C-alpha cells in the first residue's frame, strides 16, 4: 500500500486544538498500520507544549492498565488517533522543548515508544538528532523536573550472579559527562557546574530504580558523579540491590514478589536520557548544584512525547 501521491497541505489552516481518546497499537491494541502517512504543511509556523499536553495522561492510564492485567519486556507501541482528528509532529532539529517550531507535519499514529519505567536515568529511548538538548518548564523554579536528552546511546549491563551489579564502559561515561557539563555551562551564562548524589526521601529517588525481567534493581550511583573524574576512565561496575519489594508505581499502596532462581538475570539497555534536579536557595555562589531526582514517572513519557500534539480536523479554519 506504499505511495500516497499528494503529500503537502496548501491553504488556510484546518486544525484546531483539542484532545480525545487515542488507542494503543503494536505488532486490546490493534495491528499497527504498515502504511503510515505523513503530510507537510508548508509555511506553517507552529507552537507546541510538552508539559501542558493531554497525552502523557493517556499514556499513564494505558501503562497502569498494562501493569494491572499483567515473559516480560517492553514492547514498542504506537498511539493511533480516531477519525476526524490528527496528530501533529514537530520535526525541528533543536527544539528547546516548548514554543514554536516551523517544520511541522501531521501523522495518524505516533512512532513506536517502549514504556520504560525507571527514574534518574532514561533507558531504551530514542536519541536526539543533533546536540544534547535540555528540557524543563521553568529555568528558575529549581523544584521543577530536568531532562537531558543525550545524543549517544550508552550500553548498560545489569547482571545477577547465579548483590547484583551493572557494568558500564566508563570512558564513554566520562566523555558524555564532559559534553553534558559543556551544555549546562552554556545554559547558565557560563557557571561552574557541580553534581551530587540524591538527598532525602525513600530509596525511590536516592537510588536509581528500574525494572528488569520482573525484578526491580536499585543502584547506588555514587561513582557516576565522582567529580574527581571531571581512574574513572576505565570500565566501572556499580553494585546494585535486587530490591524485591518497592514503592507502588502502580497507584497507591504496595506489592510483593518472590525470591529468584539460581540462574543469570541480566538486562542490557541503552542509557539515552537523564533525569536531574536542582538545589538552590543560597545563590549567591558561583556554582550550580545538581542531584538526580525527578521521581515522577510521567516525566519519562514527557521526554518521549514532546514532538506530538493532538488536533481536531475540520475544513474552514480561519487565520
Amino acid at each position, epitope marked *: 500500500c506504499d505511495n*500516497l*501521491w*499528494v503529500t*503537502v*497541505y*496548501y*491553504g*488556510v489552516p*484546518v486544525w484546531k486544538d483539542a484532545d480525545t481518546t487515542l488507542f494503543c497499537a503494536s505488532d486490546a491494541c490493534v495491528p499497527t498500520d504498515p502504511c503510515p*502517512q505523513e*503530510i507537510h504543511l508548508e509555511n506553517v509556523t507552529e507552537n507546541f507544549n510538552m508539559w501542558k499536553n493531554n497525552m502523557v495522561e493517556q499514556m499513564q492510564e494505558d501503562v497502569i492498565s498494562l501493569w494491572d492485567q499483567s515473559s516480560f519486556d517492553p514492547i514498542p507501541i504506537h498511539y493511533c488517533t480516531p*477519525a*476526524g482528528y*490528527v496528530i501533529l509532529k514537530c520535526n525541528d532539529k533543536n527544539f528547546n522543548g516548548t514554543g514554536p517550531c516551523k517544520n511541522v507535519s*501531521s501523522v*495518524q499514529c505516533t512512532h513506536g515508544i517502549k514504556p520504560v519505567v525507571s527514574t534518574q536515568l532514561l533507558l531504551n529511548g530514542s536519541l536526539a538528532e543533533e546536540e544534547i538538548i535540555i528540557r524543563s518548564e521553568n529555568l528558575t523554579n529549581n523544584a521543577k523536573t530536568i531532562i537531558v536528552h543525550l545524543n549517544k546511546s550508552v550500553e548498560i549491563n545489569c547482571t545477577r550472579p547465579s548483590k547484583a551489579y551493572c557494568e558500564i564502559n566508563g570512558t564513554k561515561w566520562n566523555k558524555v559527562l564532559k559534553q553534558v557539563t559543556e551544555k549546562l555551562k552554556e545554559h547558565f551564562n557560563n557557571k561552574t557546574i557541580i553534581f551530587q548524589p540524591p538527598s532525602g526521601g525513600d530509596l525511590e529517588i536516592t537510588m536509581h530504580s528500574f525494572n528488569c525481567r520482573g525484578e526491580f534493581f536499585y543502584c547506588n550511583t555514587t561513582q557516576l558523579f565522582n567529580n574527581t573524574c571531571i581512574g574513572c576512565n576505565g570500565t566501572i561496575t556499580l553494585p546494585c540491590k535486587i530490591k524485591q519489594i518497592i514503592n507502588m508505581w502502580q497507584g497507591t499502596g504496595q506489592a510483593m514478589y518472590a525470591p529468584p532462581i539460581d540462574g543469570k538475570i541480566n538486562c542490557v539497555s541503552n542509557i539515552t536520557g537523564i533525569l536531574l534536579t536542582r538545589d538552590g536557595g543560597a545563590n549567591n555562589t558561583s556554582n550550580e548544584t545538581f542531584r538526580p531526582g525527578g521521581g515522577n514517572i510521567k516525566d519519562n513519557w514527557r521526554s518521549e512525547l514532546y514532538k506530538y500534539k493532538v488536533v481536531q*480536523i475540520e*475544513p*474552514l*479554519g480561519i487565520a
Partner: antibody
Amino acid sequence: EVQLVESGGGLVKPGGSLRLSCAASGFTFSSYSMNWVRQAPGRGLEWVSSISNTSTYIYYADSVEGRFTLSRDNAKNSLYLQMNSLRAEDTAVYYCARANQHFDWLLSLLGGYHYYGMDVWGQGTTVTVSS
Amino acid sequence: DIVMTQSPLSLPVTPGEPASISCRSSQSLLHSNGYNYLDWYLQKPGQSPQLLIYLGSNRASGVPDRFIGSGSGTDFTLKISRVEAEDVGVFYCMQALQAVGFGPGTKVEIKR
C-alpha cells in the same frame, strides 16, 4: 450574464514575477471552487491549480508547486494568482473556471475533489517569457 | 500520479453519421459512491473550452442530448449519435479523483 474576466499577462523576463486575476460576476462565488488551467502554444490543456469555496485545500501541479501562489477573498469576488519565479516554458494561455466540489475524508486528512465541473471558463489571457 | 490516455488521437468524421472516442485511466474512478469522477470537455478553435459531461455520464445543461457518456471504472467511451460541422474541435478527457488530470486531446476534423 454569468462570466469571469481575466486580467494580466505579457512580456516578463525570466526570474521575474507576475499576477493574474479573475473577476467573477454573475454567480454565488462563495459557493464554488475556482481553478486555474493553462495551455501552451501548440501543446494541449494542462491543469495548473485548484482552490475551494472557503479558500482551503489548495492542490498545485508538479511544475507549479513552490512557485505559484493561489489567494482569494470571497468579498471582492476575485481570484488572483501570483506567478513567480517564471521559466520560459510557462509561456501559455491561462484560464480560470469555476468547479463544483465534494469534500472527502479518505485522503489521509480531509481532501475534496477540487474540480469536477468547469462549465464557465474565463476569456483566456496570454503570458509570454523570453528575452 | 495518474496517467490518462485517449483514442483515437485523430478521428475524422462526417456531418451526419455517428462517432465515438475513448478514454482510459491508469486507476479506477469510483469512490464507493456509485458515480465516476471523470469529465469530458471540448475546445472549439480560438474560443475557450466548454464542458460536455461531468461525473461519469451526467450531461451538463445547454449540451444537446446527442452527447452520450459511457463506461465506468477504467474504460470510458464518449459516443455521439449524429453530428454536424459545429464540433470541429478537440475533445479532452479529465480525471478528478486525486487532484485534477487532463488528457492529451483527441483532435477531430472532417472526412475528405
